[PDB]
Amino acid sequence: SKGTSSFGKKNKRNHILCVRCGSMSYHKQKLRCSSCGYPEKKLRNRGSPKARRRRGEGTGRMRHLKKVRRAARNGFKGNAILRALRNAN
């Protein structure tokens, strides 16, 4: 009753895909992601010290940041076509 019989009724799925963080944590009734806190503007304060190691900055692709490290290393010379045009004048 309390255990094995009651697990047959667990066919609802409350936490669905979050559109911000992509974890299966967006609640349907609550309309809030339990992981990242969407749709609050700021990110939810992560519930563990390891949660930054899993989900924080640097754990993803860092598509813009890897470009701006490379430009900062070279001195922010920017677009190579426009670099020669500013140098001629």
Residues in contact with RNA by the rule CB under 7 A = 2-4, 6-7, 9-15, 18-25, 27, 29-30, 32, 34-35, 37-39, 41-74, 76-81
Give strand ranges (E) for the chain.
15-17, 24-27
Q: Which is nearer to Zn ion, 20 or 46 (CB)?
A: 20
For residue 26, count CB atoms less than 10 angstroms from its CB and return exposed for 0-12, middle for 13-18, buried for 19 or more: buried
35 lies in the site for Zn ion, by CB under 5 A: yes
**What size, in residues, is the chain?**
89
Closest CA to 40 of 54, 51, 52, 30: 30
Among 2, 5, 7, 38, binds Zn ion (CB under 5 A): 38
33 lies in the site for Zn ion, by CB under 5 A: yes
Q: Which does 86 bind (CB under 5 to 8 A by kind): RNA, Zn ion, Mg ion, none?
A: none
